Design a protein around this ligand. Structure first.
Ligand SMILES: *[C@@H]1O[C@H](CO)[C@@H](O)[C@H](O)[C@H]1NC(C)=O
Ligand SMILES: *[C@@H]1O[C@H](CO)[C@@H](O)[C@H](O)[C@H]1NC(C)=O
Lengths: 424, 425
């Protein structure tokens, strides 16, 4: 049942993987469930080389030298649910060969040289779920080929050369939950580029060339997760997220944000993770109601001097807080947000700290106060903080080191303080 | 496609009718249904040919109904059906007549039911059958004759039943069987030839049984890879125990009242990577591991063993985790030879000191537990050389002072319960 080079398993899978083979091995069982041809030298495929396998559900050609594929090279697989073509030499989408894989739920064309997509690509695949186009030479989003995929739940166009996303490019994919555009060249988004996708919960625009805020996302009522980081965006309007009330996670960092509406982050009750970094010119804080449910907050690279009392009355969910690398000169009491396990205050201008500031925080393992100006610390401040394995006081102006308990902590960094008494 | 009201139908012909409290098969279900999930409904019984109008039905899930008995003609339609799950029902007996003609069936779940009896014609034609779940039932014997009807079976669970005796040649006709689960039975006796015929068997589970003797029957198992006999009554592991199973990789013996282990018992296994022995109260000596050099995890606990053989770390270069806790060990031979060690558990022994060279050289070693010993002295520089050490447990020993060298980068260093004089001051 199993020809020499391959190996055949319990469930009817046959691994010809990594055999240095130029052609489909002959002698394989016709009851083969799965076939793995990955990592071989197969340069080309002949007519119907898979026709003798009627039951074959999964076909892995990943990582071969395959350049072109005869239109009929797969005919006999109407039961095929998954086809992995990744890491091969394809300069184009094998449109004709994909005619009549009518059962196909997974198509990986990612990591090829693909420049062009023939207009009729993916015409019959009505069952397709996952389409991987990424890591290719794609110059534009293939509107026609994607109009044939009403079942698609997930798509990656990432790591291509795309510069612009036309209006209604995704218009026919209503089942789509996940759209990945990251690491393209995109400079321009049509106002209607995202129209039609009312099920999309996840959008990746990261590592692109964007400049305006992408208000196209107003077409996305189901949006949960949004990345726009590493772009050129200069402005986050108030009204930015108004039409996306379900957002849990926003990644905005690595943009030259010169401006952020104070209220841009208002009224997001599902928002658990908010990351803002390296916004150089942005001078100030968020309004942040009705967002009380925030889990992790990162705000760094700015001018803010301080934080409101309401902050820890209203956020009872907050676990990690990264305020580092700001201009902050002062600190409110943190007792309120009881869920705090991590607080990073380092590289600010803060001068002093009191007792109750860190009072009643049970779960806090990590506190980084390092690289500040702090000239003194009250003796009873850290008495209350357990779980604490890491306290970084290093690189301040302080002349005397507090306790306790600093006893039993795994790390206490006191380095770089001008401690006059110890020098003696 | 015509999906009826309780159901949710997909694009491939699946129909999920589960959890809607149905007492009979829904009408209006497509004739092209490939998969039908009827699980978690209230169906008590089902009539003849209920599935007759599903010519293409591949999978049928009846699990989690009240199902009591079934009309011998209820499954008549289905020659395409490859998977059938009846588990979690009231079946008092294996429905042998209902299963006649299911010629495509690869998976049969009769598990989690009340079955007392398996008729002799049971599974008569299922020559495509792969997985058979008879576990969690009332069976008092292994169904020899039904099982002879299953030349293709790769996996069998008789587990969680009342079987007390396995006669010779019981499994004799399953020559495709790779996996045999007998765990949680009452088995006190195994006929010498009870495993004859299973030459493809890679895994045997005898755990949680009544065995007084080592199971010499495994001599029928040339391809055995994994063997559990844990939680039995075996007091002794004989010489040549595994001499017919040279391919063994994993053996689990723990929770047996072992007083003695043969000198050649664990010898000559070149494929053995995992050996677990725990709670052998009267074993006084480290087993002889001559010829077994490829050990990866070794666990030897609960014994009177007072020392470790000098040859040990000379021979095991693959050893990664070593659990020696809960013995009588009073002195440590050098672990230096065991170069792959990432984890060492010595807690709850008699140990007194650790010297400079005990642990010297183990560059991969993250976890060291020396707690609950007698240790009064640790050479300074003893944990020098351990670049990977993240966990050091020195607690509940006699140390008056502690070494600091090599000890700063640790995520966890536990000193509790030692008598440190300087720090009481
Ligand atoms: C271990 O077994 C070998 C081979 O039987 C033998 O040479 C050696 O003495 C044994 N070690 C003991 C009995 O401690
Ligand atoms: C202990 O062993 C280390 C590593 O081999 C060595 O550098 C050190 O000098 C030894 N110390 C003593 C006192 O033998």
């Amino acid at each position: 049942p199993c020809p020499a080079p391959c190996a055949c398993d319990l469930d009817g899978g046959a691994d010809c993987s990594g055999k240095g083979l130029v052609t489909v091995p002959d002698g394989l069982s016709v009851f083969t469930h799965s076939l793995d041809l990955s990592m071989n030298n197969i340069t080309k495929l002949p007519e119907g080389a898979f026709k003798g396998f009627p039951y074959l559900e999964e076909l892995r050609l990943a990582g071969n030298d395959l350049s072109i594929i005869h239109p009929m090279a797969l005919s006999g697989l109407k039961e095929l649910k998954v086809l992995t073509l990744q890491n091969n030499q394809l300069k184009t989408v094998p449109s004709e060969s994909l005619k009549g894989l009518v059962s196909l739920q997974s198509l990986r064309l990612d990591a090829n040289h693909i420049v062009t997509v023939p207009e009729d690509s993916f015409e019959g695949l009505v069952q397709l779920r996952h389409l991987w186009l990424d890591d290719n030479s794609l110059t534009e989003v293939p509107i026609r080929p994607l109009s044939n995929l009403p079942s698609l739940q997930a798509l990656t166009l990432a790591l291509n050369k795309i510069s612009h996303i036309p209006d209604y490019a995704f218009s026919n994919l209503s089942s789509l939950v996940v759209l990945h555009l990251h690491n393209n060249k995109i400079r321009t988004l049509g106002p209607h580029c995202f129209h039609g996708l009312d099920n999309l919960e996840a959008l990746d625009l990261n590592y692109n060339n964007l400049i305006d805020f992408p208000d196209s996302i107003r077409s996305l009522p189901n949006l949960k997760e949004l990345g726009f980081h590493s772009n050129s965006i200069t402005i986050i309007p108030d009204g930015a997220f108004v039409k996306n009330p379900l957002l849990r996670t926003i990644h905005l960092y690595d943009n030259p944000l010169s401006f952020v509406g104070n209220s841009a982050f208002q009224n997001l009750s599902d928002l658990h993770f908010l990351i803002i970094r390296g916004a150089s010119n942005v001078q100030w804080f968020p309004n942040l109601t009705g967002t009380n449910n925030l889990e992790s907050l990162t705000l760094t690279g700015t001018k803010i001097r301080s934080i409101p009392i309401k902050f820890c009355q209203e956020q009872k969910m907050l676990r990690t807080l990264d305020l580092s690398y700001n201009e902050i000169s002062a600190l409110v009491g943190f007792e309120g947000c009881s869920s705090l396990e991590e607080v990073y205050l380092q590289n600010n201008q803060i001068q002093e700290v009191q007792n109750e500031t860190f009072q009643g925080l049970a779960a806090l393992r990590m506190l980084d106060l390092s690289r500040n100006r702090i000239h003194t610390i009250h003796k009873e401040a850290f008495v209350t903080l357990k779980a604490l394995t890491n306290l970084d006081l290093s690189f301040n102006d302080l002349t005397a080191f507090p306790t306790a308990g600093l006893h039993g902590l795994n790390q206490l960094k006191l380095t770089g303080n001008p401690n006059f008494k110890e020098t003696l």
